[PDB]
Curated annotation (Swiss-Prot), chain B:
Record lineage: Eukaryota, Fungi, Dikarya, Ascomycota, Saccharomycotina
Family recorded in the similarity comment: Belongs to the AAA ATPase family.
Name recorded for this polypeptide: 26S proteasome subunit RPT4
Function: The 26S proteasome is involved in the ATP-dependent degradation of ubiquitinated proteins. The regulatory (or ATPase) complex confers ATP dependency and substrate specificity to the 26S complex.
Gene: RPT4
Post-translational modification, as annotated: N-acetylated by NAT1.
Complete-protein stretch covered: 340 to 436 of 437
Swiss-Prot record, chain C:
Homology family: Belongs to the proteasome subunit p55 family.
Entry keyword set: Acetylation, Proteasome
Chain ranges of the PCI domain: 86-260
Description of post-translational modifications: N-acetylated by NAT1.
Name of the protein described by the UniProt record: 26S proteasome regulatory subunit RPN5
One Gene Ontology term from the biological process aspect of the record: protein deneddylation
One cellular component term from this protein's GO annotations in UniProt: cytoplasm
Other comment: Present with 5710 molecules/cell in log phase SD medium.
Gene: RPN5
Organism expressing this protein natively: Saccharomyces cerevisiae (strain ATCC 204508 / S288c)
Role this protein plays: Acts as a regulatory subunit of the 26S proteasome which is involved in the ATP-dependent degradation of ubiquitinated proteins.
S-S pairs: none
Curated annotation (Swiss-Prot), chain D:
Entry keywords, A to Z: Proteasome
Other known facts: Present with 12400 molecules/cell in log phase SD medium.
One Gene Ontology molecular-function label: structural molecule activity
A Gene Ontology biological process term: ubiquitin-dependent protein catabolic process
First and last residue of the signal peptide: none
Protein name stated in the entry: 26S proteasome regulatory subunit RPN9
Name of the gene: RPN9
Family: Belongs to the proteasome subunit S11 family.
Cross-referenced Pfam families: PCI, PSD13_N, Rpn9_C
From Swiss-Prot, chain F:
Protein species of origin: Saccharomyces cerevisiae (strain ATCC 204508 / S288c) (Baker's yeast)
Entry similarity comment: Belongs to the peptidase M67A family.
Role noted for this protein: Acts as a regulatory subunit of the 26S proteasome which is involved in the ATP-dependent degradation of ubiquitinated proteins.
Full protein segment contained here: 153 to 254 of 338
Other comments on record: Present with 19800 molecules/cell in log phase SD medium.
Changes after translation: N-acetylated by NAT1.
Protein's name in the database: 26S proteasome regulatory subunit RPN8
Source superkingdom: Eukaryota
């Protein structure tokens, strides 16, 4: 599932990640399947940035 | 042949074999000193070791009637005359094949 | 025992008390059995002695109470297998002594047993399982507290070429000191059996490492003459340790195998796959270093 | 209070060290112990002959040690107790320091609510292990070090300082034992974990550089001679008499060259008695490396013994022995044929990096790049029923 | 085995369910009984040792002769003989399970 | 730094049926007749061709531009050369006996 996320490519030491949202989604997701738990994060590419 | 090949027959405890059987049993339960084992074996002629275990119990019954927790020598005399009649009537000298 | 009637006397004890008991204690009983085994060693009937060992159970020596008789039980067995020049069996018997806590715990007492174990494992012929057992001792840290033992053992543990004259000269004064493997009178002639094992080792190492060799070269590699080389290979084919083809005019000796078309191209099947595997891994490692660096 | 502590050490001290003391009064009074942490660290560079420093550290051990990073208490103390060559004294002080950190930590983890104080305990075990190595109780340190190892692997958030103390200590253990191979690799791990932060001196660089070079020469499986050359450490000191030959020996091995190598070996028998009983080893070693270089550098993988014979300045009998030794050691896998007189190798352990080795790999791919490209046109064109 | 009701696929091992009766007796040792603690069957304990005890220590002698080491003993006799008690006494000597 | 884990993609048998029939193509996850298997040989070789080029180029840019050395890449690619087959060996001769047989 999507997380709220921003980036500014001027300085990549700046980005926005929502701290509320993850907890709430994890709680919901434990109900639907028992498989589901946070095992990483995806990047949408197109390459592997050092950011 | 090749499953059972030898036959070992078990007979009864003997006149001095029956003697030993008393000794194991008296120790196992409670008693106040008994010694009448030389007579008791003659009374108990032809008994299996299962019925020697029953006799101790038999004396055990007599004693708890006199309100004792220990088996008297007198009960053991009483026990063995009782068992003996009962033994002959339901008697078994048999060999199985 | 003092007397000459040791023949007669040996026999008396063994006939009567070999038979079971129903009212004798086990402690008392074992002690006579060791005696009976000792007397069967003195007579030269070791065929007697092997039965007497097993007429008392191995499972009555694994208590601390019969820990004292554990030392004796395994002492007498060594000798029985030692006379029939069967070295694989001696080594295990002695490793039970080492693992005995009194021997293991004291600094001095472990030393004589551990040197015995090493000697017999090295005189044993190289099996498949043999490599694992000598490499147990190798992993031991009390191997490292002797140096005579240390140097001696590592040579054959590892696959490496070590010439027969270097062993003959060097290790004669080192190992003739300890008795009953190289300095007994019946075990002096176990230096001849040191020669067979080193060269047997030499031939197994060479088997991997060569695949075709002349016979003329091989005489230097083992330091044995032409006649001796050919003969010592031919017996190894009968014990089924190697496969070689031996050319009797002093030509060539090939330690390699007849092959099939299929088998040889299985290796090519693997080289091609693995080469490709590398091209895949390389492709994403290059991109990674491209962006980041 | 602190006034006596600082004033006494001035007289004992060299005059050029007088301001430092007074700067320790000054940043106590400001109540700014950020600059104090730097000043103590600096102190032992300028005063490593005199253990004025150890006596100074005692006061600050029992005051700020949660009001300063604990990482910094381990950095200044280490120079003091390493160079202490009374090692009973070293052990005793370190054990009392560990008891203060174990009490402290339980309240202070929630009290600061921003800081940690469990980090410090691991490092003290490392210092304790080093003191035992010098003292020559190598076994006592190693079993301390193994228990410490376990704890570290189960953590992943640990500082870069923690790994630096542990590997340094592990290297000193293999140098006492004289395991050349083991030393080389674990000292490489210290170099990586080096911090711009003061936890090194100028002395230590030059001395690791000496010990690395010596181990390398005498390894049984090393061929990381080119990896050392290119490394900063050994680059800077080659202009001193000790490290002059030492560089040129390392260089002559890298390049397989015998004319420079053998000329050096004569000198070092007389000069150094370490290398006067490894004379036989070093000559076998240069020949061993060169052997792998000559077949491999070619695109033909199978090579007659003769060419090797003039190259390693050995007759044919030793050629085969060199080759056999490599296989044993697990540096090559392959065969020896004295029938066909060939060595046919088929597995190689990684070569040294050098620009020109790169060039030979890049040219080698060219050869077979042509075949893929030309065949890729033939197969495409051909087939008229590719999906018809 | 235990297998899904969703796909009919064996998911996982189900270790076999022990049958209680035989299992109790495997678990604990039923021993010792003493040879001279049994009276009048004393001969019959010994006779069992020759059948069972001899080839177990050494199968080695029976193998020399080439005649098979002998097994299979049928125990018989009127009930209460205590031949199940003798079963224990034989195997008590060997320390057999 | 980041360690490549290879991928092949998988789905349960629950999901998979819906994938197979929704698809309305030839598929690179299934195949038909001989004709499609000629296609596959051209596609598989084309991938090698492109991938080799990246390796050479990487070797160039190390000695030109002077990006830092990696013994992970250079070391793996050292192995490739010893694994390499060559011609004129008894092995290729055993391939030809099998080609006549088939
Ligand atoms: N030889 C003996 N010594 C002591 N007790 C005995 C002896 N023989 C028989 N008994 C007694 O008889 C009881 C019953 O014997 P058990 O082994 O259950 O017999 P069966 O299968 O012949 O019925 C024993 O548990 C024991 O109390
Ligand atoms: Mg029964």
């Amino acid at each position: 599932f999507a997380l709220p996320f921003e980036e500014d490519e001027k300085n990549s030491d700046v980005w926005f990640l929502d701290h509320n949202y993850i907890e709430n989604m994890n709680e919901m997701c434990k109900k639907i399947n028992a498989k589901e738990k946070l095992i990483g994060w995806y990047h949408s590419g197109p390459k592997l940035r050092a950011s | 042949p090749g499953r059972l090949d030898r036959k070992v027959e078990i007979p009864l405890p003997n006149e001095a074999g029956r003697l030993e059987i008393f000794k194991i049993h008296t120790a196992k339960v409670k008693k106040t000193g008994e010694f009448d084992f030389e007579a008791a074996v003659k009374m108990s002629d032809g008994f299996n070791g299962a019925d020697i275990r029953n006799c101790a119990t038999e004396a055990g019954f007599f004693a708890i009637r006199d309100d004792r927790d220990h088996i008297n020598p007198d009960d053991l005399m009483k026990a063995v005359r009782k068992v003996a009649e009962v033994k002959k009537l339901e008697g078994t000298i048999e060999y199985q094949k | 025992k003092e007397e000459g009637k040791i023949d007669e006397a040996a026999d008396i004890l063994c006939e009567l008390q070999v038979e079971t008991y129903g009212s004798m204690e086990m402690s008392e009983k074992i002690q006579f059995i060791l005696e009976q085994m000792e007397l069967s060693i003195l007579k030269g009937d070791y065929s007697q002695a092997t039965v007497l060992s097993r007429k008392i159970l191995k499972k009555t020596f694994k208590n601390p109470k019969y820990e004292s008789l554990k030392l004796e039980y395994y002492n007498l067995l060594v000798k029985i297998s030692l006379h029939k020049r069967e070295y694989l069996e001696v080594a295990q018997y002695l490793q039970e002594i080492y693992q005995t806590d009194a021997i293991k715990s004291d600094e001095a007492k472990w030393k004589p047993v551990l040197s015995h174990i090493v000697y017999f494992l090295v005189l044993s012929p190289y099996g498949n399982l043999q490599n694992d057992l000598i490499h147990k001792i190798q992993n031991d840290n009390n191997l490292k507290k002797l140096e005579s033992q240390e140097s001696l053992v590592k040579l054959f543990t590892t696959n490496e070429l070590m010439r027969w004259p270097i062993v003959q000269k060097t290790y004669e004064p080192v190992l003739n000191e300890d008795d009953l493997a190289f300095g007994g009178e019946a075990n002096k002639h176990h230096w001849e059996d040191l020669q067979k094992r080193v060269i047997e080792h030499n031939l197994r190492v060479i088997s991997e490492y060569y695949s075709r060799i002349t016979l003329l070269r091989l005489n230097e590699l083992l330091d044995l003459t032409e006649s001796q080389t050919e003969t010592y290979i031919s017996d190894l084919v009968n014990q089924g340790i190697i496969y070689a083809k031996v050319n009797r005019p002093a030509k060539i000796v090939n330690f390699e195998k007849p092959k099939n078309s299929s088998q040889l191209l299985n290796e090519w099947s693997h080289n091609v796959d693995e080469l490709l595997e590398h091209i895949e891994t390389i492709g994403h490692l290059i991109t990674k270093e491209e962006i980041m660096h | 209070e602190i006034d006596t502590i600082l004033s006494t050490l001035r007289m004992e001290a060299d005059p050029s060290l007088h301001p430092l003391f007074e700067q320790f009064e000054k940043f106590y009074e400001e109540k700014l112990w950020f600059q104090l942490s730097e000043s103590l660290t600096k102190f032992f560079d300028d005063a490593k002959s005199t253990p004025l420093r150890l006596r100074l550290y005692d006061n600050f051990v029992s005051k700020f040690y949660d009001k300063i990073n604990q990482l910094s208490v381990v950095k200044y103390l280490l120079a003091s107790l390493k160079d202490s060559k009374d090692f009973d004294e070293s052990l005793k002080y370190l054990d009392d320091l560990k008891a203060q950190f174990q009490e402290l930590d339980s309240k202070k983890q929630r009290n600061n609510g921003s800081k940690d104080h469990g980090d410090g305990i691991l490092l003290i075990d490392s210092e304790i292990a080093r003191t035992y190595l010098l003292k020559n109780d190598l076994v006592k340190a190693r079993d301390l070090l193994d228990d410490l190892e376990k704890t570290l692997d189960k953590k992943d958030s640990i500082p870069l300082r923690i790994t630096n103390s542990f590997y340094s200590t592990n290297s000193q253990y293999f140098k006492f034992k004289n395991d050349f191979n083991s030393f080389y690799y674990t000292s490489l791990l210290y170099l990586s974990t080096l911090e711009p932060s003061t936890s090194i001196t100028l002395a230590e660089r030059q001395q690791l550089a000496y010990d690395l070079s010596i181990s390398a020469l005498l390894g049984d499986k090393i061929y990381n001679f080119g990896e050392l050359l290119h490394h900063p450490i050994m680059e800077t000191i080659v202009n001193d008499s000790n490290y002059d030959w030492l560089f040129q020996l390392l260089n002559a091995l890298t390049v397989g060259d015998f004319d420079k190598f053998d000329s050096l070996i004569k000198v070092q028998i007389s000069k150094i008695p370490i290398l006067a009983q490894h004379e036989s080893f070093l000559r076998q070693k240069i020949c061993l490396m060169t052997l792998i270089e000559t077949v491999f550098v070619k695109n033909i993988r199978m090579l007659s013994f003769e060419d090797i014979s003039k190259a390693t300045h050995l007759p044919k009998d030793n050629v085969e022995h060199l080759v056999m030794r490599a296989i044993s050691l697990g540096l090559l896998k392959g065969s020896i044929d004295q029938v066909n007189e060939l060595v046919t190798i088929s597995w190689v352990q990684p070569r040294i990096i050098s620009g020109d080795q790169i060039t030979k790999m890049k040219d080698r791919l060219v050869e077979w790049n042509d075949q893929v490209e030309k065949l890729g046109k033939k197969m495409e064109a051909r087939g008229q029923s590719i999906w018809v | 085995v235990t297998l899904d009701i969703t796909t009919l696929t064996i998911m996982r091992i189900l270790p076999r369910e022990t049958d209680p009766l035989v299992y109790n007796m495997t678990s604990f040792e039923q021993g010792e009984i003493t040879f001279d603690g049994i009276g009048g069957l004393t001969e019959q304990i010994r006779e069992l040792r020759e059948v069972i005890e001899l080839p177990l220590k050494n199968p080695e002698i029976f193998q020399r002769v080439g005649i098979k080491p002998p097994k299979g003993v049928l125990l018989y006799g009127p009930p209460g003989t205590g031949k199940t008690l003798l079963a224990k006494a034989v195997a008590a000597t060997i320390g057999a399970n | 730094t980041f360690l490549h884990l290879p991928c092949t993609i998988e789905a349960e048998e629950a999901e998979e049926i819906g994938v197979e029939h929704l698809l309305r193509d030839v598929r690179d996850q299934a195949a038909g007749g001989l004709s499609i298997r000629l296609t596959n040989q051209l596609k598989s070789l084309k991938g090698l061709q492109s991938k080799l080029k990246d390796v050479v180029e990487y070797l160039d840019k190390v000695i030109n531009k002077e990006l830092p050395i990696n013994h992970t890449i250079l070391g793996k690619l050292q192995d490739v050369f010893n694994l390499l087959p060559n011609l004129g060996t008894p092995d290729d001769d055993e391939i030809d006996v099998e080609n006549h047989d088939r």
